[PDB]
Amino acid sequence: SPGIWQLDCTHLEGKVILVAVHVASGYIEAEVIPAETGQETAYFLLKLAGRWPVKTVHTDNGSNFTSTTVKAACWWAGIKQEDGIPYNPQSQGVIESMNKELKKIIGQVRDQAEHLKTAVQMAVFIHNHKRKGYSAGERIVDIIATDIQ
């Protein structure tokens, strides 16, 4: 549980926003990329796993699950690559809701930056700091620290 992440890809402004969600906390990292290739996804996972203790990644689609570049990044970084089949149907709903929330926040900040990437990083900040009362940033640290001890 402390090490499980889920990939999510959403679209805005003719660009792709790649998101990794820490399932237990709802904490996220995200980046804007031109298109969702194996190489882009692989690089994103490499960054993520250097920053947080990523044990398992549920990939966002079959192309990323299949990609030998993504498999190679998971091998490199010691990540168990898994499918993202929503065996619990609540999973699709959670992702859909998160994409809607993120796009809402991006709208709220969109005029504060020229470039979408900037707005997306503002959105990451707002999402992770939002008290729901603990924030997702607080929850991830607490969950991982409890696991370490």
Ligand X SMILES: C=CC[N@H+](Cc1ccccc1C(=O)NCc1ccc(OC)cc1)Cc1ccc2c(c1C(=O)O)OC[C@H](CCC(=O)O)O2
Q: By the 8 A CB rule, do 38 and 69 touch?
A: yes
Per-residue interface string for the shown chain with ligand X, residues 82-111, x marking contact by CB under 6 A: ------------------------------
The span of 8-16, 83-91, 114-122, 136-144 binding ligand X (CB under 6 A) equals: 114-122
CB closer to a copy of itself out of 49 and 57:
49
- Supply the Cα-derived Rg of the chain in whole angstroms: 15
Interface pick for a copy of itself out of 47, 55, 71, 103 (rule CB under 8 A): 47
The span of 12-20, 56-64, 65-73, 132-140 binding ligand X (CB under 6 A) equals: 65-73
CB closer to a copy of itself out of 101 and 138:
138
Helix (H, G, I), strand (E, B) or coil at 30: strand
The span of 15-23, 61-69, 88-96, 124-132 binding a copy of itself (CB under 8 A) equals: 124-132
56: phi then psi, degrees, rounded to nearest 5 = -140, 135
Smallest CA-to-CA distance from 49 within 1, 82, 95, 5 is with 5
Smallest CA-to-CA distance from 98 within 70, 117, 123 is with 123
Give the position of tokens 């859909």. 96
Q: From the list ligand X, a copy of itself, none, pick the one residue 148 interacts with, judged by a Cβ distance below 5 to 8 Å according to partner type.
A: a copy of itself
Angle at 46 between CA 37 and CA 107, to 5 degrees: 65
54: left (phi over 0), alpha (psi -120 to 50) or beta: beta
Footprint of a copy of itself (CB under 8 A)? 29, 43, 46-47, 49-53, 76-77, 112, 117-118, 121-122, 124-125, 128-129, 137-138, 141-142, 144-146, 148-149
